[PDB]
Amino acid sequence: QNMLDNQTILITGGTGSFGKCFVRKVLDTTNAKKIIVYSRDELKQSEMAMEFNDPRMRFFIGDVRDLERLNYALEGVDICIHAAALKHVPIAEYNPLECIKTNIMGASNVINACLKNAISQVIALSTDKAANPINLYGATKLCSDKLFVSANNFKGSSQTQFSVVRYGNVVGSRGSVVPFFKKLVQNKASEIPITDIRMTRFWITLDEGVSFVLKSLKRMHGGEIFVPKIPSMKMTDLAKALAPNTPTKIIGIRPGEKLHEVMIPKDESHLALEFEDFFIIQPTISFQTPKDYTLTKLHEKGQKVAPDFEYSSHNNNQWLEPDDLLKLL
Amino acid sequence: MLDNQTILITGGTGSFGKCFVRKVLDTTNAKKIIVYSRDELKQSEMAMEFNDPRMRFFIGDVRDLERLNYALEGVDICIHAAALKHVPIAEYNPLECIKTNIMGASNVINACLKNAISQVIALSTDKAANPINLYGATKLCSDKLFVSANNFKGSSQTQFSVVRYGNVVGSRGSVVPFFKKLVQNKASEIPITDIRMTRFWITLDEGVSFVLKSLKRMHGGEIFVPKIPSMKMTDLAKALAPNTPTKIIGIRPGEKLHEVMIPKDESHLALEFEDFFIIQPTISFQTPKDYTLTKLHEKGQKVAPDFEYSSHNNNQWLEPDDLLKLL
Amino acid sequence: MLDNQTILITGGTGSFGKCFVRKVLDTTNAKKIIVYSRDELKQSEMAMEFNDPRMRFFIGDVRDLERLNYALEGVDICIHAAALKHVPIAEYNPLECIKTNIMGASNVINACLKNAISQVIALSTDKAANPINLYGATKLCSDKLFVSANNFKGSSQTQFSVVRYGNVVGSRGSVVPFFKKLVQNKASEIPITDIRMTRFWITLDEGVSFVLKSLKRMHGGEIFVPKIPSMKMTDLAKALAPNTPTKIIGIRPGEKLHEVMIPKDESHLALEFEDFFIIQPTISFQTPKDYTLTKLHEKGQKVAPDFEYSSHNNNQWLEPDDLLKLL
Amino acid sequence: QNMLDNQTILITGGTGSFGKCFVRKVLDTTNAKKIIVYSRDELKQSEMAMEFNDPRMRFFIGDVRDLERLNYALEGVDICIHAAALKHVPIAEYNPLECIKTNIMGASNVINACLKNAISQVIALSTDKAANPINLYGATKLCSDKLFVSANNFKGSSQTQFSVVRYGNVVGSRGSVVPFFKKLVQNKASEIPITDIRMTRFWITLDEGVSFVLKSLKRMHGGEIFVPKIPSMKMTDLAKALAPNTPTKIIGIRPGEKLHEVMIPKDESHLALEFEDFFIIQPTISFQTPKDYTLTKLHEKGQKVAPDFEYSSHNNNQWLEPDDLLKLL
Amino acid sequence: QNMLDNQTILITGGTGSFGKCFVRKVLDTTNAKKIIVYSRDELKQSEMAMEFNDPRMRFFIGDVRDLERLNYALEGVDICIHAAALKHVPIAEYNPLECIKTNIMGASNVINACLKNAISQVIALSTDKAANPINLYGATKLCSDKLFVSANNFKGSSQTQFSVVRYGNVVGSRGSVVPFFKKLVQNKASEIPITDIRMTRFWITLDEGVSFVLKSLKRMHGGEIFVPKIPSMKMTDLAKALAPNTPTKIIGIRPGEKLHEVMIPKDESHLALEFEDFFIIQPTISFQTPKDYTLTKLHEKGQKVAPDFEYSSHNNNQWLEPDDLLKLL
Amino acid sequence: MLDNQTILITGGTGSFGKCFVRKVLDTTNAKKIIVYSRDELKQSEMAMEFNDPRMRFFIGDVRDLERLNYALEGVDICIHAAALKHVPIAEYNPLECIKTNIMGASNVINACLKNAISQVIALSTDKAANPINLYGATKLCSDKLFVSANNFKGSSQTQFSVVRYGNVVGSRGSVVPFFKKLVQNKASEIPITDIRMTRFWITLDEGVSFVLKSLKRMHGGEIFVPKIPSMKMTDLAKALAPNTPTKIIGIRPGEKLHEVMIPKDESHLALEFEDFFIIQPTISFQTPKDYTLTKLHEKGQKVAPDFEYSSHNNNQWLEPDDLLKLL
Ligand SMILES: NC(=O)c1ccc[n+]([C@@H]2O[C@H](COP(=O)([O-])OP(=O)(O)OC[C@H]3O[C@@H](n4cnc5c(N)ncnc54)[C@H](OP(=O)(O)O)[C@@H]3O)[C@@H](O)[C@H]2O)c1
Numbered sequence A, D, E: 001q002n003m004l005d006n007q008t009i010l011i012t013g014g015t016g017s018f019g020k021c022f023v024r025k026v027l028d029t030t031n032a033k034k035i036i037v038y039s040r041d042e043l044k045q046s047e048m049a050m051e052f053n054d055p056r057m058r059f060f061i062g063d064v065r066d067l068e069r070l071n072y073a074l075e076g077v078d079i080c081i082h083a084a085a086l087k088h089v090p091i092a093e094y095n096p097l098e099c100i101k102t103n104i105m106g107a108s109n110v111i112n113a114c115l116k117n118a119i120s121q122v123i124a125l126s127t128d129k130a131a132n133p134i135n136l137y138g139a140t141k142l143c144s145d146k147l148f149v150s151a152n153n154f155k156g157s158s159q160t161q162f163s164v165v166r167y168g169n170v171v172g173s174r175g176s177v178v179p180f181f182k183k184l185v186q187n188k189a190s191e192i193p194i195t196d197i198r199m200t201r202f203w204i205t206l207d208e209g210v211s212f213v214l215k216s217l218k219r220m221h222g223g224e225i226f227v228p229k230i231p232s233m234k235m236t237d238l239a240k241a242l243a244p245n246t247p248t249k250i251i252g253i254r255p256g257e258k259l260h261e262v263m264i265p266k267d268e269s270h271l272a273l274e275f276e277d278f279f280i281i282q283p284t285i286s287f288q289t290p291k292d293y294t295l296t297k298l299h300e301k302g303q304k305v306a307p308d309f310e311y312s313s314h315n316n317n318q319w320l321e322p323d324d325l326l327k328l329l
Numbered sequence B, C, F: 001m002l003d004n005q006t007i008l009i010t011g012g013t014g015s016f017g018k019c020f021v022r023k024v025l026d027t028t029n030a031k032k033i034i035v036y037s038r039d040e041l042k043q044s045e046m047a048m049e050f051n052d053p054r055m056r057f058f059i060g061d062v063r064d065l066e067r068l069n070y071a072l073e074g075v076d077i078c079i080h081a082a083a084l085k086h087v088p089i090a091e092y093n094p095l096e097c098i099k100t101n102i103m104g105a106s107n108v109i110n111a112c113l114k115n116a117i118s119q120v121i122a123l124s125t126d127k128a129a130n131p132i133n134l135y136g137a138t139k140l141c142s143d144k145l146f147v148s149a150n151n152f153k154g155s156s157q158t159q160f161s162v163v164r165y166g167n168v169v170g171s172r173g174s175v176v177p178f179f180k181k182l183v184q185n186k187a188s189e190i191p192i193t194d195i196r197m198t199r200f201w202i203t204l205d206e207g208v209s210f211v212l213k214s215l216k217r218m219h220g221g222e223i224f225v226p227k228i229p230s231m232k233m234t235d236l237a238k239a240l241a242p243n244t245p246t247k248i249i250g251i252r253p254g255e256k257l258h259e260v261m262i263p264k265d266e267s268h269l270a271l272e273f274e275d276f277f278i279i280q281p282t283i284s285f286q287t288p289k290d291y292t293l294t295k296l297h298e299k300g301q302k303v304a305p306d307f308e309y310s311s312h313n314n315n316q317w318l319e320p321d322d323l324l325k326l327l
């Protein structure tokens, strides 16, 4: 059908929530020649291998902190999706160096190995927590994003493309709150943990995130930070539609948590280009051979935003009602 | 007090470094002051400049853990000022900035714990709050490492704190010096970015003073922020060179319009004092601490629910004339 | 005794790990129990599960010596259970298994000696005796490193011992659980390898108990082996799901027919006790030891010249009914 | 004459007993273009250079623990023979990590460097002590064997072949007992150290081992563990034919020593294929592109063994009498 | 005009005294396609970028102790000039390991990266202090010189050439005495630091050194140690012509300082070839494919020197009078 | 004194090593002598040769810091004799020579300081003075590292000194042995380089004696040089095999005609004693020292302004007959 046919793809952190959904989508909707899962845990890999049991799959035990392992794993790969990461904010506050080794040094290693093996396209997953970050996790992702964007300056016998995909909370992520709220009410809940009233968070489904990454692959030139237009939901309605029969206590705010998440910093608007269903944050730096981010590879046109624009979760027009939420298993 | 104590300063040959060393020699009884940095040229010139037997120079890189392990032997206080701070160069050389600022912080922490240092103060920047540029992001990572380092409880107790302030009036590579280089020479154009641009301003000497004061009242874990004035860049021009044309070049790479010192999202962690703030740790140390009362028995009060210490809404600014009283 | 002592368990989020932590909290006065492992998901879930102030979680890899050096500060006892144990995955990712199991053992040993740990027990496996698969070979290398580590005689004395046992009834990824996943669901075929296949069987709780008992009587250098029953796989089928068809798939990669616990070639090193064996070190420590008498004054006797503790000639087996009394 | 002509060969541990014999054989019987000796000791290399003084020789000082050194040394090499190792069983029991660094990490490094330089064929030397091992040395060799076999899965622009050659004790090896027994009786012996009566060990000559490695090069597909059919000798007759004029005291059994050495584990028979003068143990794992180990490159046919077969030193039919032994200087 | 046109050049330590002069010369007199400055300090690089502000320039922050950084920086480079170093003799005596890491390991890393990226020509800067050295700095440079010369033995798909350029004190170097003497008399001098009467040092201008390096590029075969014929000046006349109005105290001799610097050791004469304006010290070792150092690439002929020759600063015929010295700003 | 002290010798299986070990066992009360080297063959043969319970053998490389850290635990004196010394092989394998001799010195120093060794003596060579070959250059770098290491002043004080002497009569790989291998066999040609060639000559036993004496009087920082005779190579021929033809092959790679022991450029640093010299450090230690008076209260005098201790102008030579009285 398209660009993914006959291609070999490797995804770091492939056993994760995004990873399994992405792998499933690629196997179902493309004629990819091979899909390589690269992660550390033998348990999750053994079970994922049984779950998919697809001969197009390959499982490599390995750490993104291990450059030599990455060099060997990326051999013969055409496309690399970087989803490996330590993302638990509070655990990242208590174990800062671990988050740094995995998220930052991990990014640097993947970049190095992708260049060495002449990969064609690379997309690293980012987070809104990386825009004007306050927590350690967010700062490591910002460093990662900067590394990937800057990697486009390089120019070997083959010019590898590196882009970033940034979006917010995933509805009911592997460790999200949705899957947490359902476990409570299920195990006979009598109180739900809440943080703040005016709280706000962008929301997108796992499948939409995956589809967004794949579409970004088709339109990317390299160096872009892709941001999808997604609705916002106040935590108030979230708990009511997932447990209206039990009360909620305003527990203490987690370490390093924001009230509202930023998607596009006000100070970076001048780099932002708006499109129909997404935004593109252009590089702050200039490369050897510039790119016209105004027109994607899919011939889509984008227009600069307002010099004062700022994609925040509280100044958004899209809001998902308690209904469709329940429509998300 | 540094009374007959041994102090080591990473990046000691830099602007902050030389000023700090001068102050320590002149105002304390430190028995030894160690400069740890890479450049043999600057260290040779500094040695001749500070021809004092209390000085000791170690050529070394903060990316070199073994070298730091050796240099920090017998040290009581460590001031960490080594860094790559050029924002645009950091955007073009991100991994280099990460190696020096982030891994450098990790190595300093490791070497300080191993040598049982008593107190450590790392220098931060306002660019580390709600950062948008790479330099700022590495400094935020550095700050987090130093704050978190307080959880260790080995043999000798080691305290780690951070000092965060803005632009240093006429710093090494700063703008003021850049303009004094244009005014004293046949100029005609004053490079400018925006118009609403604002920044916090502190002098090199005030920075050094604040670090010294921070050492005396730190418990370990604080990010100390001094109350300093803000100044619109449309005044620093009508001061360093009035009656002169200024062309609006525009915003620079990874640059903000206003710098933040204390994020609104962290106000609840902030404690106000007469002339400074303390941003408390986001984590809980096995051995808790009360930051409401410094070692100097100074009392601090929590701040308003939506407090925002920014260079745009500062309740104090510098005068275009008092600005020249620094140069 | 763990009386107000600090204990750290590598791979603490695993099957053995969670069971061990529960036992220590409930049956001893350990002041602190530290979990050292890589996964933030399992540690976050375990923290909520074991919401106890005596717990402490460190994200870390046993391949990271610096991280272990830090995490083992102030620890008295270290239980080493971190490992890559999936035989076929280890055959396809040999260097990964070697890095974790072998280098991991070397790093743990190094960090324990540096932090002056008192006692260390590493978990082994019957697959490490006369091994044929890679996993088994790395565990044998790990066992040798831990036994040899006893030759060190620095500041504080550190004892290192190994605990070796077989298949853990319904372990994480085991077969029993795999069958309980087939029986409770629309099944029709029970995957089987051989017919003469046999294995030793010990419960998770018995494993944890044996480790605790090993700590109390170890001198350092022993490979402790518990006397446990054997069970032919043609019974584990006529128990977990009788009246059901079982297809003979065949032997798996790097798999044996019978597992060995004490090799005939090492019998001369074995000492028998009422309910366990001690395989003495092959080397002579500068500071000798008498393994015939444990710390618990238990007496052990040498074994027959051609003794062979295998899962095929075991003088005790599990009943197809007592087998279900575990599940 | 054959496959070795005009080829560049590098042998790690080339100054050793196997190494010197192998180098001598290659120089004498082939038109190899260049032979590189890679080892650590300047003494043995300087003397070996004087002993051979052949312009086709090249001597590289280097450690197999040093990956960067190996990468540089294997540049331009077509065939790599891996014989470097720490093999003294008791010393390996007292210095386990050293044996592991050299034997295991050394194997990993050689593999990495051979792949990087696109070597064509690689043979690593193994030992019967690596089959159902009880000592540390044997376990490290088993890990090494597993690494080399597994290295065949890789597939770069050039598919390097990796096979293993496994055999027992070498008659009068550099540190063997034969050369030990002759030094005793020579220095006026009056007592010979013995371990156990029923003891048993496979025996092969240095020259036969070398010839076997070279022949394996001609028939290998990559992934095989070559095992030669060799006779067995009880230690009883060994001491009598090498010192019948002096007594022997049953000294204590060395640390980590077996009574009988295994060549092919009973649990691996199902992988074993018998031939006229040798056996082939097939990989336990399956590669991308399978190989028909039933037919060697020399068109030799092999048949599966008995599902209960086990090549041990005590169940062997071949036994060398005290005569031919003395015929081995 | 010549060999440098359309070529990409990288100079380590490019922000230094030699570095800026070399870069300036290459930009002014050649049609080089790109010039890369590789050094650690962001301050000197930012200011050098403003000073030259030439689009043909590229600035890489990096350390020669960092192999991975060098591998990335030398990608696409044709010529590499190695000028990075720690050269302060007394500081090198007090910080020996630092000097060793930068000068020796730095040399090894540059060589490794140049080979990996198939650079065509490489010239490392040496010093007369490296001939029969007595101080640590000089010993590290001798080790460096030996590494570069030996690197010519290697032979990959592309045979990179490595040569060395050795000369003495640079008139008024970044930290020299000339710039020191002018600062004293300027800041009202009343006493000048002197070491010894019979002192002697070779002298060459920065511009001559740069021109010599560039000319060496045109004539080199690889493996040579280029030495320029330069005059000698006693320290007596140096202080008088730069400050005859103030006295001088015979301060203590710096740590590790010689009285006279050697250019060509007497024991290496047999390797030396004399030319009109320079000398060539041939390799002490023999390569695979020899070179005829008797004839440069510029068809210049050289003749062997006297078996007892020795280029010292005190047995030189060329001597610069106090006049021309002042002619050097 | 080595009275019940623990001594470790890197490169202990070498010529110097075996002689040193024999002397220490026979003439001192050292409680333990540790051999640290790489080769299992030589160590196994040496163990059988020196079947003495006071011996301990560690397989290890001086390029391996972690391994040295472990092996030097509990050591009081460290003799560093590990090296790659073949001049022409070092010319062809420069980085290997650099790794062993230079990095090896740095690792030994690091491990000695960490384990609080009391005294360390590193072996140098006359080829390290005004060197022309790579081997000599690495040894000069090694010497400088050891001298400089004395600036450290951590917990336990560690002294580092160097012992420098020339060719060892009939050393492992030397010429004398090479000739004894030609004389005892059907020879006819005696390989020769030059004619004016000269060298210093010391016996293995005199070297070992000098090291032992150096330990007793060292303060740390000295390069000890013994007063030894010189011998023209035109005599070593008319001794090891007279009435035989010698072909003039010529100068070898990186070889000098005369070796220097004390450079004229360093005379001012030299102090003369009855039978040896001390070359003082070029640097000033924070804690100064008076090398004019050894620990043995021996007095040394400065030397002449242009002193040059070379093998060509030596005031003493060996007799062609007394030369054979060594063999
Ligand atoms: N399982 C059996 O049937 C069996 C039988 C005989 C003996 N044993 C012994 O029991 C021990 C533990 O077995 P188990 O069943 O409890 O295994 P498990 O359930 O797989 O737990 C092992 C744990 O080790 C951690 N780990 C893996 N690699 C690590 C690394 N590189 N650094 C740090 N932590 C790492 C993993 O946690 P993270 O993913 O969070 O890192 C994992 O949870 C083994 O060592 C084995 O010798 C087990």
Ligand SMILES: O=c1ccn([C@@H]2O[C@H](COP(=O)(O)OP(=O)(O)O)[C@@H](O)[C@H]2O)c(=O)[nH]1
Pocket: D089, D169, D175, D176, D177, D178, D193, D194, D195, D196, D199, D200, D201, D235
């Ligand atoms: O001092 C000794 C050493 C060894 N052996 C025996 O000789 C055989 C070979 O020993 P060696 O050290 O030559 O080789 P290894 O089998 O340990 O590789 C073994 O079966 C030992 O039992 C012996 O009788 N006396």
